Design a protein around this ligand. Structure first.
Ligand SMILES: *C(=O)/C=C/c1cc(Cl)c(O)c(Cl)c1
Length: 125
């Protein structure tokens, strides 16, 4: 296991060193999105939460195709406001229910250190 806690204040610094393999060592789901919501990285813990195969979702549009239940002001709206502003750091609970048993999670979105990239972190609640 990579020893990083969900919600850590410096999480973007810690995850900046991680290739796809290190990311798979986290205790929580981690997705990296570009500013348009395309999936750049998607770790094993996230796949365990959602059932999706991490390798297959990379390159897909998160808000349009993968996760339409997040296409709402409560999730996508927060993301895009952060992308527009350049300073995203928001945490909230949410239910994932698209083609899956509804699953309640805690979501933390945070701007990455790599230029136009944004993390979505997820854990069960
Ligand atoms: C609602 O449609 C959510 C779906 C969903 C959310 C996340 Cl974070 C995720 O990783 C997947 Cl594959 C689907």
């Amino acid at each position: 296991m990579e020893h990083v806690a969900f919600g850590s204040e410096d999480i973007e610094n810690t995850l900046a060193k991680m290739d796809d393999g290190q990311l798979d060592g986290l205790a929580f789901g981690a997705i990296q999105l570009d500013g348009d919501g395309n999936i750049l990285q998607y770790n094993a813990a996230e796949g365990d939460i959602t059932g999706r195969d991490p390798k297959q979702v990379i390159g897909k549009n998160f808000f349009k195709d993968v996760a339409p239940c997040t296409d709402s002001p409560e999730f996508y709206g927060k993301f895009k406001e952060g992308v527009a502003s350049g300073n995203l750091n928001t945490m909230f609970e949410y239910t994932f229910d698209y083609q899956m048993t509804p699953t309640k999670v805690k979501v933390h979105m945070k701007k990455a250190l790599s230029g136009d990239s944004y993390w979505v972190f997820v854990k069960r609640v």
